[PDB]
Nucleic acid binder design. Structure first.
Ligand SMILES: [Mg+2]
Ligand SMILES: [Zn+2]
Ligand SMILES: [Zn+2]
Ligand SMILES: [Zn+2]
Lengths: 240, 98, 98, 48, 77, 35, 144, 65, 98, 255, 115, 44, 379
RNA sequence: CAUAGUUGCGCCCG
């Protein structure tokens, strides 16, 4: 009650101005993306000249795609960090994220700076066509754009290829929720019927419907989970 | 006479074919109604397109549910005759047997 | 390709897929395939010219319809199987620019 | 069949004895109300 | 040979309050002072705090035997 | 001669409007039934 | 017939549900004790169920389209059972992770983050209006 | 359907202006200038005539009762 | 009657063998909004079948470009299976190969 | 310990709107005044639509709703008219309501626009305001509409059809001198038409002693009442409300 | 269905008091005025006028629920000036202010119409 | 009861004992005439 | 408006909006859907801002005064149907208003609203239990088999049609019109997946407002946006503001670089507004300036088919099943609610054994049998 | 107060 009645005086809002950054920030993001795409081109050149040596436990293709993945990941993280440092004290995305009440830092970096790499089953977008992700690319193109790296923020708007790859990622998320709802409660309804009758008897022992002892004391201490909490033992860590 | 075939609305044999919007207003029919459905006992019934594997074509797959390395299959069927689509498999057995 | 774009013997929606690497020419004329129109590109230039757009601006009281666009060999239908053998420009204003 | 009357999740067991319809039960859409204590629920007049 | 805890369990509090409230709803005699009370649950709560409910809980030990505790014999949780 | 990049934005929508005026959005059902 | 309406002790009346009656409240799927909790009823003059916003989080509830189920205990014994076991204040701490199950929510959480900033200042009228809503206030306006 | 009697947000009368607004469109004004000619300065009121679809004219093609 | 029964029920095959027939082919047309009607008319269904247990089709494959809506599925247990055509999506009506 | 001495200056007066300034007053008083403007000014609006016959393309209560929102010229008649629930009669009399009649028969090929002109009152001192003219409905050849209705006193709190104002513009501290609002970048913000700053300025310098005063008003009448009459009726009504509350408090203290 | 009668947010019921007074036990010289069928239009203005009074140690108001039409006004005063006295004085001051404002507004109307 | 033909809008009385048909059009869809009972709608 | 000739048609269910509007922020493609001629929704001044707290958690505060002005008012049409027939010659059902003594039993619902044919004439108020088709099957006196309405409906019989069926039987269809006004709990959505329920309805004065006297029509929760990241919603609001000021339907074709937020902001600034769409709003209750400024503008919203009257129901000792002695849904949803196994084990985890017994046995289907102690079988 | 099949397929909501 108190905080809502004060919030009428204060008021809270999200708007376009909370999503806009300064021109220097966009310029830094563009420089970062240019450098990262140049690095990806260099890695593709090293792979093509057969001077990329695989890391152990990884084949040459795996080493190549791991290099590209880490390059794009650090590019996204650097751009998001730079965007976050640009946020004003009044930017209401930063208000909602600092409070922790909604969203997160990755949401701010996505909306302001770069959506990032779209993944399917934890992999970049595969060649659904013959050696191509779409009919708009030359065959055997492992560049970030062809492999589904959306390099425009939501504010900047996605190009058609970027939009389609983002739709594929969203489709994977939807299918994940679908199978989650499929397996929602089946495991739980199995567990509950295996353990429906296990209770605490008046001798403070835990027993089943068969009256077989499963624990002499509940949780090995005879303490409920409602009052226990975290502490630190001061005579474990320190030196003699 | 052999029977009665339901007619898709606005098809070439539907009465609403070719009529101007003034006529459809005269017939109490919406000129913006797209058509493409049947009326069965007054219920507007629409047929959904059904996706199926294309016919008469060679597909090599990797059957993991079998003792076969690969299986080449082809669903063979004629042009609008013999609705039973005879499917053939030509299959390489697994080499791991020993 | 010339015959289909002229619509002389080959009607449109007939898909001609050449697998160059496998040395195969598959021609498809069956129903059920899914296709869409696409503007034809030649020498990194559109076959669509301003005169066609002018004739389409007066689409009424001149009777130059989409069917004339298809018949003039400016836009042609392409299906998913054929799309694998297509280098498809996104938009002409930037992709096929020098 | 007689055996089908019990099996599954809708038979007399698992559909009518491990759960069933109960009287004095309502359902409807929920809406927020900050002016109610956490232990309170607003109800429509008709259900009450 | 009493081994059950002297603290009344939350379940015991719930059941004894419910049963005593039902008794008072049936015009059971009230073993506590009441003033302007009509809801039997409040009367049962007051009688519980005064520790004057005339009920003995029988706790069945899992072996088959039992203990018997008055509500006053038990420490209220 | 050739469509300019600026006029292309109008040209493509003129083409699409002519397409939908010719065909409509239920050509699938109607053409399939006619065949 | 007033004889049919006449009453004596021992009779029972199925009275319409009124303020203060306890009700069990749940949302399907039910996943833990806090997904089925007891509340006190409040009559309100429109056609929905209401919730304090915090109890949406244990129910995993949101007001996009969700509808919830309400059951009414019919015996004083069941009513007392719900009062002593199932009421939401008794269900604040969940023994799943020995944590609170419900906490401050979206607008309240952001607004209190703004509120407890070091540079928030309230004049006499604003604080005096605000203290109306503090139920557990002894009536002392503190030294500014 | 038909033009609303009042602008939903403010309550300004916008029912006696739809036919006049079309008459001004026949006079080859811009849509903005036509609305300004009718004195709709708040964009709540401008929303009505600018976004209204007049379906009742279409429904008057069919026969009565 | 036969055709009518099928278009009444959506069960396809012999009426006597309706127990093992494919179902959900014909549907009551959804008339709640005009866009809803057009979406129902331009709807495609991919059955589960024996093919479904081999490879998962719920994902949005790359060949779905420009032929089917990249983001339009019924949320729930039919995600990815039920789809809707792209705007400029035309299905081949077939022709004689002669 | 006493109320201010508030002063009024009327900047503009039309038949459509009145723009003015109240000074030497509290924020709550001004806000309550505009609340009374929107909600608690009593006017006469159509209620109790009884439709003898309808052959329109639109269902009946659609027409009743549309007639409800028709404004009526109720300048001075509203004072002497009582609320119907307070009046004593067979539910309708000239001391609580004003009868209206409408009967249109389109037997003509041209579409017949049923407008506010076609509404006929029994009392000539209550007319539709536009009587351009407000379109009620359109009728085809062979289509008619015949109904009667009443119009009774009420205020916008009960239903928005009794709201006489078509938007009440309200402002105070146009330069943000009090800093009741905090522009994160005041340079971006356009000046108000009551602002007095220069172009280099974007806010007045902050005052740690100011209070809300000099409230700028613009009451735009829908047309039912003259806006001057809207403000006078509003002040009289709020005075009546507080006097009645004082009477009830006197009863409460005496009891 | 369960929509309230729209004409009952300002209109009283049978045996419903427009205003009731309750002495607040927590603090001496403090009372709660519960006023029925009134919105913020009276609560806010009465609170503002009360705050201008110097003897008022504390004055506030609340709506207990927006769907309901009660307002609780808490008034606390120095121990020489009753809360009822303060409430009456506030209402009289507001009535005088509104009468003065109406008079000046009519005079300004006449001046603007002539000039 | 009186009924109105759905094609030519002919008002005609039809008893509840015979097949319904317009008395000079042959059309077979009727509509009941509007009730003559009083009906009131609040304009709210 | 799902179709133009909806008035002639009699479908089982239909909904029509009073005042549809083509969206102020459209796409080129919408011209060819014909959605410009059959819109579904209204452009509404939406303010994205937290308020008293009834918009929270994907809820919506609506302007009660706007709804009083017909904002999002709609009609819900049902069309009931019944057919007379002749089964053999031992019976022949017939349309006619029954009488208490001519029939061997009838429900308390009044039959004195039908005519001699037993069909209510169009233009009469009906309830959730009145009789619409008086149909009686002859007993081999007679037994009434008339039809009533859904229990949770109160409309007006709009259009009554009588026809001969395929076999040649006098049968009737009856449209019933019920006017649905937006209320608390009705579901609304943007064109961006921001599904929300009407939390509460405030009159215009209680709502916040700009310096121009413009209140918002709808007040969403800003916390909807950060997790969802529906920035097209915000750009639509800005573009609609630009469109409404400029007097031109704005284009929102997705992959068009001719429109970016910078140009939209510059155009908005040209009309004397904050270039990012924010505005200073005044508290409706106190009149105070809000400390922060509020993003606000027109946005195309659309009311969904779901309403609380469709979903609200309650059960207390109603029509139990004929087999299991358990509640079933008849004429309505009035079959209680399945106390599923999840709820059962939830109560077991609570330890509320008495309430669980009450739900499963003492308030669902209490029965008693007599068992012989010697054998053990029910006797 | 009391009286209105299943048994499936499809579809809508979270
Ligand atoms: Mg939900
Ligand atoms: Zn307006
Ligand atoms: Zn009277
Ligand atoms: Zn006829």
């Amino acid at each position: 009650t108190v905080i809502n009645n004060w919030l009428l005086i204060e008021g809270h809002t999200i708007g376009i101005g909370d999503s806009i950054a300064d021109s220097k920030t966009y310029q830094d993001i563009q420089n970062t993306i240019k450098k990262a795409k140049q690095d990806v081109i260099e890695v593709i050149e090293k792979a093509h000249n057969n001077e990329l040596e695989p890391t152990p436990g990884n084949t040459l293709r795996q080493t190549f795609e791991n290099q590209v993945n880490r390059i794009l990941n650090d590019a996204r993280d650097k751009t998001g960090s730079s965007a976050q440092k640009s946020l004003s004290e009044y930017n209401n995305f930063k208000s909602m994220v600092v409070s922790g009440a909604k969203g997160s830092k990755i949401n701010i970096s996505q909306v302001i700076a770069v959506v990032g790499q779209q993944n399917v089953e934890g992999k970049r977008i595969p060649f659904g066509f013959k050696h191509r992700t779409l009919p708009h690319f030359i065959k055997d193109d492992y560049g970030p754009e062809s492999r589904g790296f959306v390099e425009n923020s939501y504010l900047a708007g996605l190009t058609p290829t970027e939009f389609f790859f983002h739709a594929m990622g969203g489709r994977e998320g939807l299918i994940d929720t679908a199978v989650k709802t499929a397996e929602t409660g089946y495991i739980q309804r199995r567990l509950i019927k295996s353990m429906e009758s296990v209770m605490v008897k008046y001798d403070a022992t835990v027993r089943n419907s068969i009256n077989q002892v499963v624990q002499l004391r509940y949780g090995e201490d005879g303490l409920a989970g409602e009052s226990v909490e975290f502490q630190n033992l001061a005579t474990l860590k320190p030196s003699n | 006479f052999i029977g009665k075939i339901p007619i898709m609305l606005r098809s070439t044999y539907c009465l609403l074919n070719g009529l101007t919007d003034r006529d459809l207003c005269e017939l109490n029919e919406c000129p913006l109604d797209p058509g493409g459905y049947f009326i069965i006992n007054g219920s507007e019934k629409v047929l959904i397109a059904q996706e199926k594997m294309a016919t008469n074509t060679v597909y090599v797959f990797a059957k993991k549910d079998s003792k076969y390395a690969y299986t080449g299959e082809c669903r063979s069927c004629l042009e609008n005759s013999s609705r039973p689509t005879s499917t053939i498999w030509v299959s390489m057995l697994a080499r791991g047997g020993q | 390709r010339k015959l289909r774009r002229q619509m002389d013997i080959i009607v449109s929606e007939v898909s001609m897929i050449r697998d160059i690497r496998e040395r195969e020419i598959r021609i498809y004329t069956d129903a059920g395939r899914i296709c869409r129109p696409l503007l034809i590109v030649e020498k990194q230039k559109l076959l669509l010219k301003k005169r066609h757009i002018d004739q389409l601006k007066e689409r009424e009281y001149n009777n130059y319809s989409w069917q004339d666009l298809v018949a003039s060999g400016v836009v042609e239908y392409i299906d998913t199987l054929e799309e694998e053998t297509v280098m498809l420009a996104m938009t002409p204003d930037d992709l096929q620019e020098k | 069949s007689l055996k089908q009357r019990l099996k599954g999740k809708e038979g007399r067991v698992r559909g009518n004895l491990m759960g069933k319809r109960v009287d004095f039960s309502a359902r409807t859409v929920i809406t927020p109300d900050p002016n109610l204590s956490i232990d309170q629920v607003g109800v429509p007049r008709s259900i009450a | 040979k009493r081994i059950t805890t002297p603290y009344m369990t939350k379940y015991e509090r719930a059941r004894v309050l419910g049963t005593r409230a039902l008794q008072i709803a049936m015009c059971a005699p009230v073993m506590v002072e009441l003033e302007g009370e009509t809801d039997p649950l409040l009367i049962a709560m007051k009688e519980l705090k005064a520790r004057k409910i005339p009920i003995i809980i029988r706790r069945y030990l899992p072996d088959g035997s039992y203990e018997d505790w008055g509500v006053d014999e038990l420490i209220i949780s | 001669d050739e469509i300019t990049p600026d006029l292309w934005q109008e040209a493509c929508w003129i083409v699409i409007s002519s397409y939908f005026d010719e065909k409509g959005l239920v050509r699938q059902q109607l053409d399939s039934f006619d065949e | 017939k007033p004889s049919d309406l006449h009453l004596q002790t021992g009779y029972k009346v199925e009275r319409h549900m009124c303020d203060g009656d306890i009700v069990i409240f749940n949302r399907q799927p039910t996943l833990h004790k806090m997904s089925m909790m007891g509340h006190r009823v409040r009559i309100l003059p429109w056609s929905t169920f209401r919730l304090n916003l915090s109890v949406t989080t244990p129910y995993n509830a949101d007001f996009d389209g969700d509808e919830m189920n309400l059951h009414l205990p019919q015996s004083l014994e069941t009513r007392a059972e719900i009062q002593e076991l199932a009421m939401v204040p008794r269900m604040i701490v969940t023994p799943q992770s020995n944590r609170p199950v419900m906490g401050i929510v979206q607008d309240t959480l952001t607004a209190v983050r703004k509120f407890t900033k070091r540079d928030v200042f309230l004049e006499r009228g604003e604080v005096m209006n605000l203290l109306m809503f503090l139920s557990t206030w002894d009536g002392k306006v503190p030294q500014p | 359907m038909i033009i609303p009697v009042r602008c939903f947000t403010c309550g300004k009368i916008v029912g006696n202006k739809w036919e006049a607004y079309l008459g001004l469109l026949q006079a080859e004004y811009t849509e903005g200038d036509a609305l300004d000619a009718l004195g709709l300065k708040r964009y709540c009121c401008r929303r009505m005539l600018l976004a209204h679809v007049d379906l009742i004219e279409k429904l008057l093609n069919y026969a009565p009762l | 009657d036969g055709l009518k029964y099928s278009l009444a029920t959506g069960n396809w095959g012999d009426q006597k063998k309706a127990h093992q027939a494919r179902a959900g082919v014909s549907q009551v047309l959804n008339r709640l909004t005009f866009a809803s009607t057009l979406s129902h008319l331009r709807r495609l269904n991919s059955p589960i079948g024996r093919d479904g247990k081999l490879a998962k089709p719920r994902q949005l494959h790359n060949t779905l470009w420009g032929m089917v809506c990249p983001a339009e599925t019924p949320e729930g247990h039919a995600v990815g299976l039920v789809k809707n055509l792209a705007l400029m999506a035309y299905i081949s009506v077939g022709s004689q190969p002669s | 310990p006493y109320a201010n001495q508030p002063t009024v200056r009327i900047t503009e007066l039309t038949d459509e709107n009145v723009k003015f300034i109240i000074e030497n007053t509290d924020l709550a008083v001004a806000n309550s005044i505009r609340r009374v403007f929107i909600a608690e000014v009593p006017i006469i609006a159509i209620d109790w639509v009884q439709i003898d016959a309808n052959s329109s393309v639109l269902h009946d209560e659609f027409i009743a709703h549309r007639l409800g929102l028709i404004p009526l010229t109720s300048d001075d008649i509203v004072d002497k008219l009582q609320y119907s629930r307070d009046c004593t009669c067979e539910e309708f009399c000239p001391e609580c309501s004003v009868e209206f009649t409408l009967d249109v028969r389109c037997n003509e090929d041209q579409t017949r626009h049923v407008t506010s002109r076609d509404l006929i009152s029994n009392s000539p001192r209550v007319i539709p305001v536009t009587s351009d003219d407000i379109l009620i409905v359109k009728l085809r050849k062979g289509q008619e509409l015949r109904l009667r209705a009443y119009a009774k006193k009420g205020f916008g709190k009960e239903h928005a059809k009794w709201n006489p104002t078509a938007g009440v513009a309200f402002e105070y501290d146009p330069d943000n001198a009090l800093r009741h609002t905090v522009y994160p970048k005041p340079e971006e913000w356009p000046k108000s038409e009551y602002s007095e700053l220069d172009e280099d300025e974007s806010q007045a310098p902050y005052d740690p002693n100011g209070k809300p005063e000099r409230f700028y008003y613009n009451v735009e009448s829908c047309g039912s009442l003259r806006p001057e009459t809207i403000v006078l009726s509003a002040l009289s009504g709020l005075k009546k409300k507080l006097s009645d509350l004082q009477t009830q408090l006197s009863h409460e203290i005496q009891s | 269905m369960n929509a309230p009668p729209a004409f009952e947010s300002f209109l009283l019921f049978e045996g419903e008091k427009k205003i009731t007074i309750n002495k607040d036990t927590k603090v001496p010289n403090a009372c709660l005025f519960t006023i029925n069928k009134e919105d913020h239009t009276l609560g806010n203005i009465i609170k503002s006028q009360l705050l201008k009074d110097p003897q008022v140690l504390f004055a506030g108001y609340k709506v207990p629920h927006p769907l309901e039409h009660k307002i609780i006004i808490r008034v606390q005063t120095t121990p020489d000036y009753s809360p009822q006295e303060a409430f009456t004085n506030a209402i009289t001051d507001l009535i005088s202010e509104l009468s003065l404002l109406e008079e000046r507004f009519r005079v300004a109307i006449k001046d603007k119409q002539e000039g | 009861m009186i009924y109105i033909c759905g094609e030519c809008h002919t008002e005609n009385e039809i008893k509840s004992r015979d097949p319904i048909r317009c008395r000079e059009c042959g059309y077979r869809i009727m509509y009941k005439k509007r009730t003559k009972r009083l009906v009131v709608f609040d304009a709210r | 408006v799902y179709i133009t000739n909806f008035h002639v048609r009699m479908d089982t269910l239909a909904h029509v909006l009073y005042y549809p509007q083509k969206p102020l922020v459209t796409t080129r493609s919408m011209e060819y859907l014909r959605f410009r001629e059959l819109p579904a929704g209204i452009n509404s001044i939406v303010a994205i801002a937290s308020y008293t707290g009834y918009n929270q958690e994907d809820s919506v505060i609506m302007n009660r005064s706007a709804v009083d002005r017909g904002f999002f008012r709609s009609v819900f049409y049902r069309s009931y149907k019944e057919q007379e027939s002749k089964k053999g010659f031992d019976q022949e059902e017939v349309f006619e208003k029954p009488t208490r003594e001519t029939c061997q039993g009838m429900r308390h619902a009044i039959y004195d609203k039908l005519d001699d044919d037993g069909l209510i004439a169009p233009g009469v108020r009906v309830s959730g239990d009145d009789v619409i088709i008086g149909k009686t099957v002859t007993l081999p006196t007679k037994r009434d088999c008339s039809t009533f309405l859904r229990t949770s409906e109160t409309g007006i019989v709009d259009q009554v049609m009588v026809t001969l069926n395929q076999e040649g039987y006098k049968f009737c269809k009856i449209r019933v019109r019920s006017v649905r006004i937006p209320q608390i709990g009705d579901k609304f959505a943007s064109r961006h997946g921001q599904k929300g329920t009407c939390g509460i309805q405030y009159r215009q004065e209680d709502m916040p407002f700009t310096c121009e006297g413009i209140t918002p029509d709808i007040i969403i929760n800003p916390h909807a946006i950060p997790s969802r990241m529906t920035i097209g919603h915000l750009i639509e609001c800005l573009q609609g503001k630009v469109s409404a000021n400029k007097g031109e339907i704005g284009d929102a074709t997705p992959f068009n670089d001719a429109v970016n937020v910078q140009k939209i902001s510059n155009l908005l600034s040209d009309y004397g507004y904050h270039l990012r769409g924010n505005e200073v709003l005044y508290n409706g209750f106190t009149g105070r300036k809000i400390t922060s400024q509020i993003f606000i503008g027109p946005t195309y919203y659309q009311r969904l088919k779901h309403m609380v009257d469709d979903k609200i129901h309650s059960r207390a000792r109603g029509p139990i099943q004929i087999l299991n002695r358990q509640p079933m849904e008849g004429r309505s949803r009035d079959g209680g609610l399945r106390f599923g196994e999840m709820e059962r084990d939830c109560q077991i985890a609570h330890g509320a054994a008495q309430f669980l017994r009450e739900r499963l046995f003492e308030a669902s289907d209490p029965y008693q049998v007599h068992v012989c102690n010697l054998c053990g079988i029910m006797a």
